[PDB]
Amino acid sequence: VQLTAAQELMIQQLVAAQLQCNKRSFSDQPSQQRFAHFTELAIISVQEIVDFAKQVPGFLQLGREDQIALLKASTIEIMLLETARRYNHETECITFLKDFTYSKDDFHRAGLQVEFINPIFEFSRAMRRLGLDDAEYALLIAINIFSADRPNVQEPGRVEALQQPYVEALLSYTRIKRPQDQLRFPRMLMKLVSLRTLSSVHSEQVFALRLQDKKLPPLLSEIWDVSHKILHRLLQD
Amino acid sequence: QLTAAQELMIQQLVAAQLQCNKRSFSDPKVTPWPSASQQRFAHFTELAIISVQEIVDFAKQVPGFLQLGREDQIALLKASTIEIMLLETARRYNHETECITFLKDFTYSKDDFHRAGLQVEFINPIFEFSRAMRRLGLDDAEYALLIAINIFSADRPNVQEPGRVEALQQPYVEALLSYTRIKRPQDQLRFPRMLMKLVSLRTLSSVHSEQVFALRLQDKKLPPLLSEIWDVHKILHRLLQD
Numbered sequence A: 001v002q003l004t005a006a007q008e009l010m011i012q013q014l015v016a017a018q019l020q021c022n023k024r025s026f027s028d029q030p031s032q033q034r035f036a037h038f039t040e041l042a043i044i045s046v047q048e049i050v051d052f053a054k055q056v057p058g059f060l061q062l063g064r065e066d067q068i069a070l071l072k073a074s075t076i077e078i079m080l081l082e083t084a085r086r087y088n089h090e091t092e093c094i095t096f097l098k099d100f101t102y103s104k105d106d107f108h109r110a111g112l113q114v115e116f117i118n119p120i121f122e123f124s125r126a127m128r129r130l131g132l133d134d135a136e137y138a139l140l141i142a143i144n145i146f147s148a149d150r151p152n153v154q155e156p157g158r159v160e161a162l163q164q165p166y167v168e169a170l171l172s173y174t175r176i177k178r179p180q181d182q183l184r185f186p187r188m189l190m191k192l193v194s195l196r197t198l199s200s201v202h203s204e205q206v207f208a209l210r211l212q213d214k215k216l217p218p219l220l221s222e223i224w225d226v227s228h229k230i231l232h233r234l235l236q237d
Numbered sequence B: 001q002l003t004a005a006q007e008l009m010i011q012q013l014v015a016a017q018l019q020c021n022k023r024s025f026s027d028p029k030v031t032p033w034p035s036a037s038q039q040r041f042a043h044f045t046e047l048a049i050i051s052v053q054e055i056v057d058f059a060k061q062v063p064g065f066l067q068l069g070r071e072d073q074i075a076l077l078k079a080s081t082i083e084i085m086l087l088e089t090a091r092r093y094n095h096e097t098e099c100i101t102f103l104k105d106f107t108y109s110k111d112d113f114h115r116a117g118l119q120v121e122f123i124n125p126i127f128e129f130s131r132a133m134r135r136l137g138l139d140d141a142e143y144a145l146l147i148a149i150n151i152f153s154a155d156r157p158n159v160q161e162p163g164r165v166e167a168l169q170q171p172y173v174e175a176l177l178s179y180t181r182i183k184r185p186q187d188q189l190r191f192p193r194m195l196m197k198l199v200s201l202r203t204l205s206s207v208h209s210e211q212v213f214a215l216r217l218q219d220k221k222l223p224p225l226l227s228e229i230w231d232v233h234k235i236l237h238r239l240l241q242d
């Protein structure tokens, strides 16, 4: 009933890597005005997500066409995990990147649909109730990435094997943090289930804006719209 | 050790699970497996109608489901119907033949489904889930617990009493946890993977919904009872009443 040096070492690598993310600030930073803002800001985040993904052990070792498959699906779900981490209960303003803060009302002005926005905030509220630290968020992101249930995964068993170390670490970490509360760990996992619904709802939202004359940029269209020239280039570096 | 209350609950579930999948191709008869496109669709829908009713009967036997409001019961059943069905496809997947089985003994190839006009996006995940489920290697108690856990999801659409639903689920999660510990003390990661399979059921259920809409474009519209649960609840409300 205690972590290993290997497990301790991995968690530190993840949070350290995770800390390199969301570094860009609104001061330091250089309908459609609202839209362009989001897409612009997504590209920054996506690019950070790919970089984070190379750092994690056992990811670069996978073949390229499955590295695409895991990233394509999880990238939105990571974003959602990160929006939830910095969700502020008092203001009800989700933070994106270092310091960009947006109320739920701010989103309606971008023309996002109520079927899409409310679940995001319900997700952010629900996760805040769990009370996860940076280590638990970092482990949960990794677990999320190595999802072998994603569409068009060529080597599922290889991916399942990569993920299992992160589950075992998270199980042991939660047991130490709350020995009395045995079901908090399952509660955290049941949240992974909520992420998919939001992932499917997101595919409906993105589509709807294509109708409103709001087409996605080159990088974001590769992974969200129904070749991966940009995506290969980011991975190959 | 396992609780006396917990033993009863598992026992009630497995028994209820036993009443499911009693129908045989030999035992009335559903429209036969072979216009050709149209007939295969019919074959599936008649069989599914039959399956849905057993799931509904099973769900009433599950404890505390009937504690719920008729509106919530309906919400819960409609969303998990496909997910229970797919658990069952996986449960009895033959790795030797790669043929999934439906009800008592209706066996189908991957090849068959392509022939029925189903899209790859839909078909591939189903066999992958059946394969992935096998790697876990669940026993009957474990399947049944996982099913009951599935039913009581608070984050389902149109649920009115989430807390009441989630309260009914925790007992089952606790039983599954306790059961895994007793049966396999040294395998700590087995129990989380089972819970994570619920994540896979969601993607499937979403993929399945897309398939149903694509089929409507093939001039293949679902019958009344399946249309309630899968299209975008009079018969289902009436089914609960018996």
Ligand SMILES: CC(C)[C@@H]1N(C(=O)OC(C)(C)C)CC[C@@]12C(=O)Nc1ccccc12
Binding pocket: A035, A037, A038, A039, A041, A042, A079, A096, A107, A112, A120, A202, A205, A206
């Ligand atoms: C509305 C948001 C939830 C945005 N989402 C999204 O898919 O964007 C579309 C505009 C629908 C294409 C998900 C992440 C999103 C984004 O893309 N950029 C961004 C910047 C700050 C906060 C949140 C976001």
Ligand SMILES: CC(C)[C@@H]1N(C(=O)OC(C)(C)C)CC[C@@]12C(=O)Nc1ccccc12
Binding pocket: B041, B043, B044, B045, B047, B048, B085, B101, B102, B106, B108, B113, B118, B208, B211, B212, B215
């Ligand atoms: C294609 C199948 C996977 C069938 N399902 C489904 O949703 O397909 C529709 C065409 C939309 C109806 C899911 C269970 C399904 C069914 O309805 N009857 C049936 C009989 C034997 C095996 C599998 C099935």
